[PDB]
Design a protein around this ligand. Sequence first.
Ligand SMILES: [Cl-]
Ligand SMILES: [Cl-]
Ligand SMILES: [Zn+2]
Ligand SMILES: [Zn+2]
Lengths: 219, 219
Amino acid sequence: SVLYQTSLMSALLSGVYEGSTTIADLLKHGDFGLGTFNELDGELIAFSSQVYQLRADGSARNAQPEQKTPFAVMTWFQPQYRKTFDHPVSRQQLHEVIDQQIPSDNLFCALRIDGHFRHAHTRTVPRQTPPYRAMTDVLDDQPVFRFNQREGVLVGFRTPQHMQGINVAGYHEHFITDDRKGGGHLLDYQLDHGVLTFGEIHKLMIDLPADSAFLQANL
Amino acid sequence: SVLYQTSLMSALLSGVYEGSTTIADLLKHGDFGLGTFNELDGELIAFSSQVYQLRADGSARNAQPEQKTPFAVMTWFQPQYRKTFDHPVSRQQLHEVIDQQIPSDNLFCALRIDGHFRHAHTRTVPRQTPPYRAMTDVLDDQPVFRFNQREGVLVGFRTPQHMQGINVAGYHEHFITDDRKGGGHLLDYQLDHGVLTFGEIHKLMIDLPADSAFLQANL
Ligand SMILES: [Cl-]
Ligand SMILES: [Cl-]
Ligand SMILES: [Zn+2]
Ligand SMILES: [Zn+2]
């Protein structure tokens, strides 16, 4: 298993909000992952090669193969572990299960949950036009959506602290509903019951783009 | 071209001085590069699939395929640029030639020089036994070797500042003499005349080990 990363979080945060990488290009290096759309028009969630666009209004829709991303992380998901929960468990409790099984912070984890969420709180970036506001100011203004008692899918990664420059350090998780019409970037959640699958990943490929914005960015 | 990195500089600097990766394993992902030997017994230089061990006494010898490394960076060298110097040029002048041609700090460069060095100043780490002294104290005690008016080969990489956690930020260059009996990790040099070949690299593969020392290291 290889975590295949398109560009750098530092480049995204510097104001490089467009890339030439398509959703079809992402699915060449995985069936599973997360990322951002061109102009920061929400974020993607991918699992079993199905890709959805999650937008700031709490909506999900099928991603089109031609859509472009300035940043993404994909893998061929090959989980080594399965745990079924018949009783409610919080996000932080689920992370403790994963951290106990993969206690080295120096490895990546990929995690998926299929089940019934008591709640799933989401906040997703809206489409930006330059000159760009500070990301923290954009997030202050974005409403949180609260999915209550919903069946759905969670996709996430755990990133080592030794990667903080390059990627989201810690857990990054996205959510989509069973009907695939709702979801977002997760702030917190509680699983009422469902199945966790996850695995460790030892290999990271970083693919730096050629666009002039990336090349001329100050990192 | 892919820069293939075995482990992390942060893990090496934390005191993880042994890996299970062999020189033969390194040559599976390149013909060119740099790295460190188990127990920090000097450093390797590799070019056209020839690999040499450079030790603290200023000696070079052929590396054996079974020797192990805790850290290395290798590539299939595919230079896009060639410049011949008929007149003396310093290391810092040569770097200016490369930086002008590949002005984005956000890309990697691989560089090779074949030619006659006015001087090549080297300092190479000696074999360490735990408990380990601070790397800065070890370097303070290591003599500098000065190669004067020698034909030889330089191998090096330029690492983006956006990678400082993971790798040597900036230029990392090693030197070996024509007779392959002398060389080391370069501090400074001047080329009297010779040929520079170099290329940009957009892709980095980081391969994290499984040994308990790496997994239990604090990074
Ligand atoms: Cl709620
Ligand atoms: Cl000298
Ligand atoms: Zn997200
Ligand atoms: Zn060196």
